[PDB]
């Protein structure tokens, strides 16, 4: 960084880089019969 240049000296920039993000894949899934209830109350699903 420039501040770190302002205070001491490093070698030349030899292993160059640039900031980037890390995050889950995440493989987030919940398929199956246990999904379809959602648009309506599971109790109300029974009253029907």
């Amino acid at each position: 960084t420039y501040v770190r240049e302002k205070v001491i000296d490093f070698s030349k920039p030899f292993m160059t880089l640039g900031i980037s993000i890390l995050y889950r894949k995440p493989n987030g899934t919940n398929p199956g019969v246990f999904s379809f209830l959602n648009p309506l109350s599971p109790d109300i699903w029974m009253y029907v």
């Binding site: 109350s41 109300i44 009253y47």
Partner: peptide, 22 residues
Amino acid sequence: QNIGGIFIVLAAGLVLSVFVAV
């Protein structure tokens, strides 16, 4: 228990269903 307000408006027919008996 949100829209049960209509499982209960439902009753108006099951109440009305009595009359044609005579």
